[PDB]
Amino acid sequence: FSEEQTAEFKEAFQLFDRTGDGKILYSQCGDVMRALGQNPTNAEVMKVLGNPKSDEMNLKTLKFEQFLPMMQTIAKNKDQGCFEDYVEGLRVFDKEGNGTVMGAEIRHVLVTLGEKMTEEEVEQLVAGHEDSNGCINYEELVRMVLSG
Amino acid sequence: ASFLGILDIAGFEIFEINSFEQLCINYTNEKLQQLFNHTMFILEQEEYQ
Amino acid sequence: SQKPLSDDEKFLFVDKNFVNNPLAQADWSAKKLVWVPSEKHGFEAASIKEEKGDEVTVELQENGKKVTLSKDDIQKMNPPKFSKVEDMAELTCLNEASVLHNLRERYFSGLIYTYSGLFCVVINPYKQLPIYSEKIIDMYKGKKRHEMPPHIYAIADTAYRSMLQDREDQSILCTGESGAGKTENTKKVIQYLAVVASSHKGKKDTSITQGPSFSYGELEKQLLQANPILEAFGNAKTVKNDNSSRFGKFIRINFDVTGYIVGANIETYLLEKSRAIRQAKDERTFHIFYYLIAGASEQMRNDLLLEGFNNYTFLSNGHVPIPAQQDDEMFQETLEAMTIMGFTEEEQTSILRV
Amino acid sequence: VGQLYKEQLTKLMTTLRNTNPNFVRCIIPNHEKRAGKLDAHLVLEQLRCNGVLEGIRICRQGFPNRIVFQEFRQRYEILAANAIPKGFMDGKQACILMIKA
Numbered sequence: 001f002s003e004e005q006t007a008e009f010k011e012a013f014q015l016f017d018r019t020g021d022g023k024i025l026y027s028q029c030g031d032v033m034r035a036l037g038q039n040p041t042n043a044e045v046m047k048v049l050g051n052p053k054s055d056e057m058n059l060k061t062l063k064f065e066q067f068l069p070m071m072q073t074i075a076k077n078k079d080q081g082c083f084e085d086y087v088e089g090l091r092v093f094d095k096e097g098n099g100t101v102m103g104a105e106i107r108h109v110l111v112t113l114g115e116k117m118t119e120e121e122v123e124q125l126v127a128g129h130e131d132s133n134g135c136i137n138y139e140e141l142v143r144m145v146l147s148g
Numbered sequence: 149a150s151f152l153g154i155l156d157i158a159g160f161e162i163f164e165i166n167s168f169e170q171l172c173i174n175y176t177n178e179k180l181q182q183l184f185n186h187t188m189f190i191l192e193q194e195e196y197q
Numbered sequence: 198s199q200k201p202l203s204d205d206e207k208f209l210f211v212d213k214n215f216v217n218n219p220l221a222q223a224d225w226s227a228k229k230l231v232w233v234p235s236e237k238h239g240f241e242a243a244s245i246k247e248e249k250g251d252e253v254t255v256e257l258q259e260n261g262k263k264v265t266l267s268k269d270d271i272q273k274m275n276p277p278k279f280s281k282v283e284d285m286a287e288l289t290c291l292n293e294a295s296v297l298h299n300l301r302e303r304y305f306s307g308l309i310y311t312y313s314g315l316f317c318v319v320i321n322p323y324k325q326l327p328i329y330s331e332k333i334i335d336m337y338k339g340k341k342r343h344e345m346p347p348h349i350y351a352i353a354d355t356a357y358r359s360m361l362q363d364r365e366d367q368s369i370l371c372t373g374e375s376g377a378g379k380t381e382n383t384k385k386v387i388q389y390l391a392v393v394a395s396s397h398k399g400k401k402d403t404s405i406t407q408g409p410s411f412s413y414g415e416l417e418k419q420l421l422q423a424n425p426i427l428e429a430f431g432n433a434k435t436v437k438n439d440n441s442s443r444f445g446k447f448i449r450i451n452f453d454v455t456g457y458i459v460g461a462n463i464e465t466y467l468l469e470k471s472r473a474i475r476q477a478k479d480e481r482t483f484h485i486f487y488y489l490i491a492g493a494s495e496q497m498r499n500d501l502l503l504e505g506f507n508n509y510t511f512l513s514n515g516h517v518p519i520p521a522q523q524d525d526e527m528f529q530e531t532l533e534a535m536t537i538m539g540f541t542e543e544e545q546t547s548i549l550r551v
Numbered sequence: 552v553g554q555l556y557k558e559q560l561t562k563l564m565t566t567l568r569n570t571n572p573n574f575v576r577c578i579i580p581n582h583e584k585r586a587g588k589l590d591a592h593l594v595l596e597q598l599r600c601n602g603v604l605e606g607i608r609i610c611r612q613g614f615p616n617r618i619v620f621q622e623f624r625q626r627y628e629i630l631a632a633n634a635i636p637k638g639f640m641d642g643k644q645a646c647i648l649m650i651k652a
């Protein structure tokens with residue numbers, strides 16, 4: 001990192017305290033890193049926090065100086081996603097080859113497989129992209145998450 | 149493009165008076181069973197050979 | 198065990214939520230259980246009590262009755278695991294008796310569709326079953342061959358969803374003797390693709406009637422209503438079947454490249470036009486004759502010169518009625534079929550004076 | 552008329568031999584027209600004359616399947632991704648290597 005953007009990261013880090021003693025909870029840590037652009041898996045964040053349990057995730061606190069090497073570890077990963085892979089997995093659920101997945105199937109796959117989302121997380125993601133027939137173009141849905 | 153064919157044929161039928169119309173109807177059923185015999189047992193094994 | 202089953206659902210789904218009884222598991226000690234031939238039952242269940250070489254002494258379980266029969270009479274009884282199995286291909290003992298038993302105990306449990314490897318066996322129920330309903334369509338839609346119990350809708354999706362995977366044109370071929378139920382299954386395949394492979398323009402309107410609750414497309418409405426018009430101008434009661442197909446028909450449904458319905462063509466074979474003039478004993482003519490003489494309104498009754506039942510010499514057996522059908526309202530039905538399909542108001546009267 | 556019907560019957564049979572063919576085999580349960588009645592021999596003969604036992608015989612000891620070496624390589628390489636080397640190779644040999652992987 002340069003000091004330039006590290007200074008921005010200080011301002012963003014101060015914007016996740018809810019109180020005023022300058023501390024971000026271990027529970028909040030992934031979503032601070034996601035605010036600063038990053039797209040980590042839950043198991044990528046958890047590993048740099050030392051694998052805490054759910055109870056101590058509320059009670060354990062990070063300052064900026066100790067949060068900052070975590071940003072530096074997750075910033076250079078060994079892979080990252082694209083468009084080319086991500087449409088290929090969603091096109092498996094395209095029933096005729098339409099260019100569209102049914103909104104029920106897309107809600108059901110994200111909840112049932114891998115890093116398992118809540119029902120609220122999928123509903124907030126897919127709403128207003130499903131048509132009159134409840135059908136979602138996976139092409140623009142991937143562009144919506146990847147590009148902003 | 150393509151198509152889906154669906155076939156409803158007059159079945160095998162027999163009455164006190166069996167006429168030329170019934171002869172042609174039953175002949176068509178003889179052909180339909182023969183079509184199954186040819187696809188299921190003969191064409192399947194030819195492909196193996 | 199598994200999810201519970203609704204009343205309607207039990208006419209497709211087997212009951213499997215019962216206690217793991219030791220009774221039929223313990224009974225397995227009778228590993229001399231076999232099927233023996235029966236006049237009443239085709240085959241009945243019995244247990245071998247000696248084998249004499251060529252002959253075998255057997256005791257009927259059902260009736261307690263010792264018999265001696267051949268070593269080749271005795272067919273090989275399947276374990277109680279295979280009771281009411283979905284596919285006949287899963288049966289370890291493929292015997293004539295076992296196939297008869299699995300179809301029989303399925304039929305009396307109401308499960309009239311059974312797979313048999315790469316084709317199916319469908320027994321006519323002669324009973325209205327709830328299994329044909331707009332709930333059931335979206336259950337089978339896109340849903341794999343072993344993710345749902347066997348049904349005509351499953352075969353219809355399977356053909357539709359092979360055609361768009363290999364790219365080979367498909368035929369669904371209904372076989373069986375005269376009265377077996379091919380015409381009804383043919384209408385079920387057309388009903389399924391008229392809502393699964395149809396182009397959609399919007400939902401609503403629902404009436405106050407029963408629930409085939411879907412606003413089928415413009416072409417798809419006409420395709421749905423094509424069959425009753427040909428049943429009117431072409432079906433007639435026989436001794437075997439009271440709505441007997443008196444013509445054969447090949448329905449070709451055409452698709453786009455996306456996979457949506459775009460046209461349909463009906464080819465037609467042997468019409469029994471001989472029964473128009475004279476009918477066999479206890480049989481009816483082409484239904485439209487009964488519908489038109491009964492259901493015609495008083496103004497058109499004089500215009501088309503329609504005289505009464507038993508006033509036409511081309512109606513033999515007098516006024517043979519039909520069971521579970523009223524010919525009076527079937528005239529209104531077949532008129533409503535012609536208007537929906539695309540026949541003009543005068544054009545329809547012209548058909549009737551012929 | 553005999554010839555005239557036969558002429559369109561061969562036309563139908565030609566199309567049905569140039570189409571994949573799904574057999575829906577409808578069985579009559581009794582001639583007495585009873586719901587809930589099954590005549591055992593009457594159905595058993597229909598199993599015999601339609602060839603049902605013989606049709607199930609291939610169902611479970613064939614072979615109905617049916618995949619070319621290229622499509623098997625293309626759709627299944629993800630399962631066996633170190634089985635085929637990073638140099639060009641025969642399609643039959645490559646499919647055998649993933650089958651043994």
